[PDB]
Amino acid sequence: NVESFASMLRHSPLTQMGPAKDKLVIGRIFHIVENDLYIDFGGKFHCVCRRPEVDGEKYQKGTRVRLRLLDLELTSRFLGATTDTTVLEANAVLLGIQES
Amino acid sequence: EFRDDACRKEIQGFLDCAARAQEARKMRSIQETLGESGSLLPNKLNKLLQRFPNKPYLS
């Protein structure tokens, strides 16, 4: 009884989410540069969000925040290009801090 | 009849305008160009563009 990859993919939380547009997820802040917060929400790419002005002091390393995903990966194909231009980051809108 | 005594007020108005125009021109040519007001400068924009170059070929 060995779980196959298709079984792993089907039951994974990312797969059952469906489209990533307008989905509330929880991410973890791992790297902070000035006011730019790098938040990883379990996807392939992290998301960069500006530090909110209302409560910017609480946003630190390891803090868990709430995100509204807009795109797992930002790509777009421009004029004359043979492949999409990838930013190697995700697009999300910062909402607040997750509290239990 | 080109007498400056009777035209003191109007002369000063033109003289003041030249002072403002000269100062604004120097500020616009120096401070505004260096201040990067408005759109991003082409020198800084080209650095961003070359970070993601357009590829019309296959690699």
Side-chain angles (χ1 to χ4, degrees):
Chain A
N1 197 334
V2 183
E3 185 178 10
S4 62
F5 170 70
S7 302
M8 300 179 183
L9 177 62
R10 183 178 183 180
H11 298 341
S12 62
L14 178 57
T15 305
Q16 68 185 20
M17 181 176 63
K21 182 181 178 183
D22 300 357
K23 298 300 178 58
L24 301 182
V25 304
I26 299 178
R28 305 181 185 182
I29 297 178
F30 59 97
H31 192 51
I32 300 182
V33 176
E34 299 180 8
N35 296 17
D36 300 331
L37 302 179
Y38 292 84
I39 312 168
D40 171 60
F41 53 86
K44 178 183 179 64
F45 295 107
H46 60 268
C47 62
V48 187
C49 298
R50 296 307 306 265
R51 181 190 302 269
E53 308 179 0
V54 285
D55 205 337
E57 60 177 19
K58 287 182 178 58
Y59 295 87
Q60 305 295 338
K61 294 187 62 180
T63 308
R64 302 189 177 188
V65 302
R66 308 187 314 276
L67 314 168
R68 182 172 71 254
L69 296 184
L70 303 181
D71 201 335
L72 289 182
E73 182 185 6
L74 290 174
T75 68
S76 178
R77 184 168 301 181
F78 304 110
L79 180 51
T82 54
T83 177
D84 293 16
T85 306
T86 172
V87 205
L88 301 182
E89 70 179 14
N91 183 20
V93 179
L94 184 52
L95 298 182
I97 303 181
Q98 178 69 18
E99 296 181 350
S100 61
Chain B
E1 299 178 348
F2 296 92
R3 293 187 293 100
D4 304 1
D5 51 357
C7 315
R8 292 297 180 182
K9 302 181 181 181
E10 295 78 8
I11 284 181
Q12 292 293 337
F14 169 77
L15 293 181
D16 291 2
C17 184
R20 310 160 196 174
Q22 179 182 0
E23 294 180 12
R25 181 175 297 268
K26 298 178 61 178
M27 177 175 299
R28 184 178 188 178
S29 178
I30 302 179
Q31 298 186 1
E32 293 188 13
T33 299
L34 181 56
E36 313 182 8
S37 61
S39 299
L40 192 60
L41 294 193
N43 300 330
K44 304 308 174 184
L45 187 54
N46 287 12
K47 301 300 178 182
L48 179 60
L49 287 185
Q50 68 183 16
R51 288 173 53 183
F52 307 94
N54 183 91
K55 186 175 64 180
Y57 54 96
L58 290 179
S59 58

